[PDB]
């Protein structure tokens, strides 16, 4: 599983085994840095504007 995030503030779960993404999730500030958390939880984080 991978993730891809657009200029339109959209986050995208590219499962390598698929051509259609899994969870077309959606949030402001998705242009900026995203990351998988170094925990067992699949925690996501976006960060701009001291937020």
């Amino acid at each position: 599983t991978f993730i891809s995030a657009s200029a339109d503030w959209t986050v995208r779960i590219w499962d390598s085994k698929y051509t259609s993404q899994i969870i077309c999730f959606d949030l402001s500030m998705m242009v900026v840095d995203a990351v998988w958390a170094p925990y067992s939880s699949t925690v996501f984080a976006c960060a701009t504007m001291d937020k």
């Binding site: 599983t1 779960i13 499962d15 259609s20 899994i22 969870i23 925990y39 067992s40 939880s41 699949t42």
Partner: peptide, 29 residues
């Protein structure tokens, strides 16, 4: 630190969670 880990659902239920995300796709359809 309180938001460190939940330690039960994150670990071995995570593959089930990805299957559940694929289920949410079947739901989208």
């Amino acid at each position: 630190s309180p938001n460190l880990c939940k330690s039960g659902p994150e670990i071995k239920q995570t593959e089930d969670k990805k299957a559940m995300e694929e289920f949410k796709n079947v739901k989208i359809e």
